Design a protein around this ligand. Structure first.
Ligand SMILES: O=C1CCCC2=C1C1(CCCCC1)N=C(Nc1nc3ccccc3o1)N2
Ligand SMILES: OC[C@H]1O[C@@H](O)[C@H](O)[C@@H](O)[C@H]1O
Length: 391
C-alpha cells in the first residue's frame, strides 16, 4: 500500500507542539515547502533546458518566532536527520560568516541564512518537521531550503523575484551542502500549484502552469530505498562533461545545440561526451513534446516519452542503476501503466509512473514482487508550492 501523506495541518500540529515544549512558548509563524517529482526533463536544468516537475504533498514545515538576541536556535524531529537534533549559532556578520559542518541537516538552513539578500535579519527559534524522505530522491533538501527562505521573508521581506529566491536556495545547496544542483528543485518547491505540473524553461526562467488533475490518471512514485555514492560524486562530473561539449562546439549551452549539429561535430568531443550531449538534446525535445501531449490529455504519448527518457538516461547519460531499471521494467509490465522512468539525479532514489488510477493498487503489488529489495510507494496529486500561515 501507499505510505500515508500527512496534511499540512497534521505536520503543523506536530511542529507546534514540539515548539511549545521546546521553547516554552507558542510559535508565531508557520511555513511549508514541498518536495517534488520530475515528470520528465532530467539533467536538463543545468543545461538551460526544459523540465516538467510537480510539487508533492510530501513537505517540510517550519514553525517559529523571531528572537531579539541575534541567535538562531533550531530543532528537528525528523528521524534520519543526523545528530544532534538541535543546533544554535549566532547570525552571520560582515566579519564572521556561517560555515558548513555538523550536523549536516543544519547546513541547508545555515546556507539560506548566509545568502539571504535582505536585511536586517533577526535571530529566531524554529522547529523543523518533514514528510519528505531525507535524501530519498524527492528533494528533501530543496524543501528545507525553500521553507527556510519562506520563513526568513516573514522575518525580513525581500524585494526580489521568485527566481532570485530559488538561486539563493540553490547557492546554499552548492556552498553549504557541496551539491552543485540546477535550479529545478528549488523553483518547483517555490512555484508549485495544486493540480498543475510546472513547465520550467531553465534558459529564460519563463514558467508555465500545466493542468494535471484527472481522476482516472494517477502518478505513482516508487522509492528504491537505495542511493549509491555516485549520486553525489558523479553528478558534478555530468555537469563538467556537458560544459566541455558545449565549449567544444562554441555554444553557450546544450540548449543551443541540436542532434544534427552534435553529430556533425562528432570528431570534436569524446565518445562518452557525445553520449551525454545526445541525451540532453533529446531530453529537451522530449520535454517539449511531453508538455504538448499532457496538454492534449494524451497520456499514452506522454508515457511513451517517459520511457524514452529513461532509456536515454540509462544508456546515454548513464545515471540509472540496476535497482531503478528493475523498478521501471516491472512497472511497464503492468496493464494500465502509460509510462515509467527514473526521476531526479539518479543512481538510486525514486521512479515516477504515469498510470490509470484504477491500476495503482495492482501496480504496487507487482512492482514490489519483482523488486529484489524493499520498495516504498507514494500516490501523489500535484500540490501547492511554498506557503505561509500566521499563528
Ligand atoms: O545525506 C545527505 C546527502 C544526500 C541528500 C540528503 C542529505 C541529508 C543530510 C542530512 C541528514 C539526512 C540526509 N539531508 C537531506 N535533506 C534534508 N531535508 C530535510 C528536511 C528536514 C529536516 C532534515 C532534512 O534533510 N538530503
Ligand atoms: O534532472 C536532474 C536533477 O537532479 C537533481 O538531483 C538536482 O537537484 C536538479 O537540479 C536536477 O539537475
Amino acid at each position: 500500500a501507499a505510505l500515508r501523506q500527512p496534511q499540512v495541518a497534521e505536520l503543523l500540529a506536530e511542529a507546534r507542539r514540539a515548539f511549545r515544549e521546546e521553547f516554552g512558548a507558542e510559535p508565531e509563524l508557520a511555513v511549508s515547502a514541498p518536495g517534488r517529482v520530475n515528470l520528465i526533463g532530467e539533467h536538463t536544468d543545468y543545461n538551460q533546458g526544459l523540465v516538467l516537475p510537480m510539487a508533492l504533498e510530501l513537505m517540510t514545515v517550519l514553525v517559529g518566532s523571531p528572537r531579539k538576541d541575534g541567535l538562531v536556535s533550531l530543532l528537528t524531529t525528523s528521524e534520519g536527520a543526523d545528530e544532534p537534533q538541535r543546533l544554535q549559532f549566532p547570525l552571520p556578520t560582515a566579519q564572521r560568516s556561517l560555515e558548513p559542518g555538523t550536523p549536516r541537516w543544519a547546513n541547508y538552513v545555515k546556507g539560506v541564512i548566509q545568502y539571504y539578500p535582505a536585511a536586517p535579519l533577526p535571530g529566531f527559534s524554529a522547529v523543523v518537521v518533514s514528510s519528505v524522505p531525507l535524501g530519498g530522491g524527492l528533494s528533501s533538501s530543496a524543501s528545507l531550503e525553500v521553507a527556510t527562505y519562506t520563513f526568513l521573508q516573514q522575518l525580513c521581506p525581500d524585494s526580489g523575484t521568485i527566481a532570485a529566491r530559488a538561486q539563493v536556495c540553490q547557492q546554499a545547496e552548492h556552498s553549504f551542502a557541496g551539491m552543485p544542483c540546477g535550479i529545478m528543485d528549488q523553483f518547483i518547491s517555490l512555484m508549485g500549484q495544486k493540480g498543475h505540473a510546472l513547465l520550467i524553461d531553465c534558459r529564460s526562467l519563463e514558467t508555465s502552469l500545466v493542468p494535471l488533475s484527472d481522476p482516472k490518471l494517477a502518478v505513482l512514485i516508487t522509492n528504491s530505498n537505495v542511493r549509491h555514492s555516485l549520486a553525489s560524486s558523479e553528478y558534478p562530473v555530468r555537469r563538467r562533461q556537458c560544459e566541455e561539449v558545449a565549449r567544444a562546439l562554441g555554444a553557450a549551452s546544450l540548449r543551443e545545440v541540436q542532434l544534427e549539429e552534435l553529430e556533425a561535430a562528432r570528431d570534436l568531443v569524446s565518445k562518452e561526451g557525445f553520449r551525454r550531449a545526445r541525451h540532453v538534446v533529446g531530453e529537451i525535445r522530449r520535454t517539449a513534446q511531453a508538455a504538448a501531449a499532457l496538454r492534449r490529455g494524451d497520456y499514452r504519448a506522454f508515457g511513451r516519452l517517459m520511457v524514452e527518457s529513461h532509456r536515454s538516461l540509462r544508456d546515454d547519460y548513464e545515471v540509472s542503476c540496476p535497482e531503478l531499471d528493475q523498478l521501471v521494467e516491472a512497472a511497464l509490465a503492468v496493464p494500465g501503466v502509460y509510462g515509467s522512468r527514473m526521476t531526479g539525479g539518479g543512481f538510486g532514489g525514486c521512479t515516477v509512473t504515469l498510470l490509470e488510477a484504477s491500476a495503482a493498487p495492482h501496480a504496487m503489488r507487482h512492482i514490489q514482487e519483482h523488486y529484489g529489495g524493499t520498495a516504498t510507494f507514494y500516490l501523489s496529486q500535484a500540490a501547492d508550492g511554498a506557503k505561509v500561515l500566521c499563528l
